[PDB]
Amino acid sequence: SLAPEDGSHRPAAEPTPPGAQPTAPGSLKAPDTRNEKLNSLEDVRKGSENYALTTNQGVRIADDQNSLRAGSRGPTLLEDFILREKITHFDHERIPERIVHARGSAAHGYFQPYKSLSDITKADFLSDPNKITPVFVRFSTVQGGAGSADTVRDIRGFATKFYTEEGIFDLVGNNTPIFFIQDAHKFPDFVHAVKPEPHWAIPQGQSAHDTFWDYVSLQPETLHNVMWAMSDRGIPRSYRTMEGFGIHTFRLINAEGKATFVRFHWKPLAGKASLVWDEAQKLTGRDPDFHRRELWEAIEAGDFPEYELGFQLIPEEDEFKFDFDLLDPTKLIPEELVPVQRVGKMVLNRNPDNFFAENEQAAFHPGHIVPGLDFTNDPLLQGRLKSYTDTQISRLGGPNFHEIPINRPTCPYHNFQRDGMHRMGIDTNPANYEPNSINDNWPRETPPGPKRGGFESYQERVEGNKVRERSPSFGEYYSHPRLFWLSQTPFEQRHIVDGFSFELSKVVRPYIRERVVDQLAHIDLTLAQAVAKNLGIELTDDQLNITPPPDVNGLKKDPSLSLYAIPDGDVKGRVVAILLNDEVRSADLLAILKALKAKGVHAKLLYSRMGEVTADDGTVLPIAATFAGAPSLTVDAVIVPCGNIADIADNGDANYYLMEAYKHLKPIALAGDARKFKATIKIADQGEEGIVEADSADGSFMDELLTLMAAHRVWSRIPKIDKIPA
Amino acid sequence: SLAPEDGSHRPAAEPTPPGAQPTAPGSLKAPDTRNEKLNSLEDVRKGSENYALTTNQGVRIADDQNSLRAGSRGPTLLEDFILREKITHFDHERIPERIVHARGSAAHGYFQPYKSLSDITKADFLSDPNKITPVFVRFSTVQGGAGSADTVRDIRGFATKFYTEEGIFDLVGNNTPIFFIQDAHKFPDFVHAVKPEPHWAIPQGQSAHDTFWDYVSLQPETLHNVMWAMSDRGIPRSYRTMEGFGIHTFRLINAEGKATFVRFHWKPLAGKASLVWDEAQKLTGRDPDFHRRELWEAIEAGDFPEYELGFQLIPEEDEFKFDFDLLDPTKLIPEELVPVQRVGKMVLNRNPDNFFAENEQAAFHPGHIVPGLDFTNDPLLQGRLKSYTDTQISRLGGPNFHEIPINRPTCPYHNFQRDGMHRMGIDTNPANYEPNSINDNWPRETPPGPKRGGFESYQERVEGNKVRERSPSFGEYYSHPRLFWLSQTPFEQRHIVDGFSFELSKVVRPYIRERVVDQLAHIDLTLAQAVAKNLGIELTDDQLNITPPPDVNGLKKDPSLSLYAIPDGDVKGRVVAILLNDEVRSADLLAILKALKAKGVHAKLLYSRMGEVTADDGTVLPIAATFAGAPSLTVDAVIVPCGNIADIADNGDANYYLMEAYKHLKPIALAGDARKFKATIKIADQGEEGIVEADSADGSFMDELLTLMAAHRVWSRIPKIDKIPA
Numbered sequence A, B: 001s002l003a004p005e006d007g008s009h010r011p012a013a014e015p016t017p018p019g020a021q022p023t024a025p026g027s028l029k030a031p032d033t034r035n036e037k038l039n040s041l042e043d044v045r046k047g048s049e050n051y052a053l054t055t056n057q058g059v060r061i062a063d064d065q066n067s068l069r070a071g072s073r074g075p076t077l078l079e080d081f082i083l084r085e086k087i088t089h090f091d092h093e094r095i096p097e098r099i100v101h102a103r104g105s106a107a108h109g110y111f112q113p114y115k116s117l118s119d120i121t122k123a124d125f126l127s128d129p130n131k132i133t134p135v136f137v138r139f140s141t142v143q144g145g146a147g148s149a150d151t152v153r154d155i156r157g158f159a160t161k162f163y164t165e166e167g168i169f170d171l172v173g174n175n176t177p178i179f180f181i182q183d184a185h186k187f188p189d190f191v192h193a194v195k196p197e198p199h200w201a202i203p204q205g206q207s208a209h210d211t212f213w214d215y216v217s218l219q220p221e222t223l224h225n226v227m228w229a230m231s232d233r234g235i236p237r238s239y240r241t242m243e244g245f246g247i248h249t250f251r252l253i254n255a256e257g258k259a260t261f262v263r264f265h266w267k268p269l270a271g272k273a274s275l276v277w278d279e280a281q282k283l284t285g286r287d288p289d290f291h292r293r294e295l296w297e298a299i300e301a302g303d304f305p306e307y308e309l310g311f312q313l314i315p316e317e318d319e320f321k322f323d324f325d326l327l328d329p330t331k332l333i334p335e336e337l338v339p340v341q342r343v344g345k346m347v348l349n350r351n352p353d354n355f356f357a358e359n360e361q362a363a364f365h366p367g368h369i370v371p372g373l374d375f376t377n378d379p380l381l382q383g384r385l386k387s388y389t390d391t392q393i394s395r396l397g398g399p400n401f402h403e404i405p406i407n408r409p410t411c412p413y414h415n416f417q418r419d420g421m422h423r424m425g426i427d428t429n430p431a432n433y434e435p436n437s438i439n440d441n442w443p444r445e446t447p448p449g450p451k452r453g454g455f456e457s458y459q460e461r462v463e464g465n466k467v468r469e470r471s472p473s474f475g476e477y478y479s480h481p482r483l484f485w486l487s488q489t490p491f492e493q494r495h496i497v498d499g500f501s502f503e504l505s506k507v508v509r510p511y512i513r514e515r516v517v518d519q520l521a522h523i524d525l526t527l528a529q530a531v532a533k534n535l536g537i538e539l540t541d542d543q544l545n546i547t548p549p550p551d552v553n554g555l556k557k558d559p560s561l562s563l564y565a566i567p568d569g570d571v572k573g574r575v576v577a578i579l580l581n582d583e584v585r586s587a588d589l590l591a592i593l594k595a596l597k598a599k600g601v602h603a604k605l606l607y608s609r610m611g612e613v614t615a616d617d618g619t620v621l622p623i624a625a626t627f628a629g630a631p632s633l634t635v636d637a638v639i640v641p642c643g644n645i646a647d648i649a650d651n652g653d654a655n656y657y658l659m660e661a662y663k664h665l666k667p668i669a670l671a672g673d674a675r676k677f678k679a680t681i682k683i684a685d686q687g688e689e690g691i692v693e694a695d696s697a698d699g700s701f702m703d704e705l706l707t708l709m710a711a712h713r714v715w716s717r718i719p720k721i722d723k724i725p726a
């Protein structure tokens, strides 16, 4: 009996805010959240309570504290089969991590379409608004190992496994709408160049090193996605607050055989929000698991990540109607030209039970499509199709990875394939080949048709010679970078320039910095000059005269490319630090906490030590964390209630908490004598936008603070922060 | 797409200070550094200049930019074997990382003993002061993945492979002289408890979470190594500035058959030095590759890591003469009772060529001993013997891991083993068994003897029943934690208190924190009370009256357990930040650099942008990094020369640089008008010990600064930093 008598070891099986209860396996935290896939996993879920400890062969163990020896101080004996199994299993726990996207965090949920899309695709999962499709989604970074940090600057993966009634469909996308390269043949080159350098295996989780920017300087096709990575897109606040894209043009095929080109989007219903560079870098130190934690705790709290699936649709006859090639993955399709049509909603509503079994072993592959969908000749997509099955042979130990529970279809699967390492299914069919007579040819092929039919490829015409040649239509590199740049707000553009400037400052060979600056001058002179100035590089007269690339089909900006130009703020699921003192004004805290609760914003009560403090009226306040323990990096805003401020006014940690939150543009609210902290952050007597202050936390104080939180950060504060030593 | 004309792409193949050139593979950086192992790897080294690009089958490639497709916008063809091989190799790059110590950094070097040890051991590598043994050393953390951060709080591994003439000897040790647990059977329990928790796989590289403190609270045998982890031993400044220990008692066996008990030690000749927590944690975010980089750059600079091997030797007849069991690896042997005898010197003087091939694939195993060494019944060492060979079967793909180039013996090896995956050696022996007549029984067994003999185990007497039982002599858990505690300076004790407080504050279940504090009260009441206070816990009357454990064989302290109590500072290889302005006083810079050069201390020139600044005398100064890009975390002290101070006096990053270096107890030196920065760190016209100040930077100024650097940190400043907001 080692559990505490009071049952406080065990979290409540009900939704609870972040930090209120220990986190737990999803089926223990939320046993009543079900879907067809989660229910199909019941055959392999293993409990523990009230069971005897055994070997893997079912033999009960008596003494799991000692090896068998000759004498209690003697040598360990070879006959200890219980020690031997236990250490053998530990010795072989690890499997290779994914070659890319090794760092990732996943959850179960479900998808439903808003209406039947039968007129444009015969895909069964999109045929009926009442048809629910279980999903498993993994979000990831790209470069770093499985043990690397979350809030790096990097592209993010967004992969969705739809368990449909007509087969698994995997939509394996990223959080930007283009990729760095055009042809899959260059993927090992590009990835080698971004990953840690081969002599010393540095740096982890960073593109800020010579080989990455050497490759970018020599391959201008990369510049478009490099622009996105250098923007705040590269440092999202949360996987719930980034967009997702399939990048490639695919096809939808309807029952009549008509093909429509499609690009896939996910829209975050929580809005778009990103960190700022200093905060994201520092957060990789103070909490390298910040995104993983945030996702798990949002789900435990009921702040389920929701995303709307959208399609950009282009008729077959419009293939050649744009200035860029629809099959070129380094080009986006601006939403001003081709709007996203809303298709359905995905809700992620339960964590896994065991991260290794369900997350680490999940296998997604963009070749897993279903009837109603098809490929195009995008030469990056075409090469992906060879990679994702092949890599799973070593990563997951063989060709039966579809029998690992998380990967299993929920629909029927039967065929003549046999054997392979780790074969779970025991086939009874007398035949392992077709055509066969001895089993009357079962299982049988099925013709294509409007529903439940066999897969047939769209009969696209192919005409040309066998060539290793890039299409001339792909050889334009700067217009899309320039469209992206022009679409950003002035503060977004500053952050882009600072991203390039910081990264190129870590490039040891200066000629590479210069070469990158030369590429930037082909995109936009203002951007190039501002990066050059930060690097102590002077543009030449030739660089100053490079003519700007043309507009994209007449567009000189598209606001859907900005994170912030069109407000889409959502405060639910955000968190506020509350800096306590040893005699808090209980009326402020009542007003603060209830206003946050009403909008679904969480709070963390911080102090200079753990335990409790007692408010003015005797209310006992439990402390979640110390000021150092849960730094301002981990919250969206900071509130300091009135009370005995002299308690914390000389606490360097308390003062620094505010200076850090101030530098990183977060809303700050100060009630009563808490306004004494104004001098720490140098606020004028008459106040400033982005600082909420009043005699008490009552009246409009919390509404004003929540309004700032809806706008995410206080961009107008940017000029004032340069000066502050934080 | 080529090299710059000036040859600046290529590092000079001569020793250069950190930052002066791009880093490079060891064989290209230091081609004339050789040893028998480095030379033997020449059969597998592969160059690249002047060679054509080929498939792995030797076919020259003409276009490595494009897949083969039917027309330039058409589908990729299955017959593209060049794309297929390239992507296949990429798809299978990763192998499983090590179950523990997955994060690690390695280098080549050599060892030699100071005198023959033939009177106490017949081991050949210790027989002759002029017989040199090549080594390969990997230093590591424990918990985190291969892509986790370096400067976490954790134990460090320190593994040395000695390529001796009589076989490979691996000394697989850590940087503390004990382990957390007593019997190998519990290793998977302990490791599972410290590793990321299994539902959500959080936290990476941190013991600061519920499961680890749960296990500790329930297994008081862990407390000793936990004290070490929570002290600043847990956060070394560099792998060059920590101790190593084999932990277990082993035996030395001499030619006469006499057994002597031995514990192994490495003394770092650069002295003992650690970070402070706030700095270590922030550095995991600003540079998660800090120790990897620092090791590599020290070797490129000629600051080769050097270590003295040392033995604690205990005669066989003294086995039971201490108040702890020699075979208990949770107990250390105090150097006040048994002195460390110096044995020889190890010098690491070349980096590898390829991290994956040589570091990632290196396999170390403490069972790899040679004649003249032997085991004991330590029940932790005994079970380690089963683990290290077994794990290498899945990690390195099979039983031929000794044929991987880095693992190969440089002495002869021949036996009757055959086949296995990836078999390199082609055996010509007509026999694959013995005894055989058909090959006249070769290769033959060799009797044991004084030199070049076969291995025979020391004929230890074994008397006992077959039992799973812990020796009663092991059941004492508090006296070594207390001896360690009492042996630390007051500031080291404070840091211990702070480490426990920080960690337990991140344990969500409060009763776990309470149970840990109850364990601390069995060690030392001042320690327990100081942690309790930080946790808002009050000790009970019973807790206040727990009797302290007994002294260890009469010792009340042993200063060799402290990092800092006995000065052992060595500044060579340390680094100073020099904060530049746009008109540097060249006279200051000349004085600074000349003094640094005389003590082998490196400098990094920092500014508010990259490129160059020109000093008052026209000297062009290239800038290594910006104030934000190479924070004070990465240096040992900071110097601010005079010049146009107005240029940087209001720069927030420059001021914050000093506030962070101040908080972290680093020496700061300010010349001339740079003394105006004293205001930012709030400090006294008369000055303060630890801030060097003068009208100009001269010989006196620099001597003072270097004296401070020899003492590593300014511990007298600790009382002044709680108030600094940084």
Ligand code: HEM
Pocket: A097, A098, A099, A100, A101, A104, A138, A139, A140, A156, A157, A158, A159, A172, A173, A174, A178, A179, A183, A184, A187, A246, A247, A248, A329, A362, A363, A364, A380, A383, A384, A385, A387, A388, A391, A392, A395, B087, B091
């Ligand atoms: C549009 C461009 C691409 C996108 C959006 C993309 C997206 C992704 C994502 C999100 C993952 C992680 C899936 C997971 O969570 O397990 C991943 C894995 C992977 N990708 Fe891609 N990828 C792209 C291009 C490529 C290319 C060109 C190749 C090689 C030809 C490639 C090969 C791989 C491989 C080897 C994995 C590991 C897959 C596994 O172990 O299961 N990807 N990719």
Ligand code: HEM
Pocket: A087, A091, B097, B098, B099, B100, B101, B104, B138, B139, B140, B156, B157, B158, B159, B172, B173, B174, B178, B179, B183, B184, B187, B246, B247, B248, B329, B362, B363, B364, B380, B383, B384, B385, B387, B388, B391, B392, B395
């Ligand atoms: C005195 C206590 C121990 C010390 C000093 C120690 C030290 C180390 C070191 C330094 C490494 C990394 C070697 C390298 O750099 O590749 C390592 C790896 C490892 N150790 Fe230990 N260890 C201890 C206890 C244990 C125990 C009790 C076990 C299991 C019974 C164990 C199993 C392993 C395994 C599985 C590896 C991965 C080895 C490999 O993949 O090549 N260790 N150990």
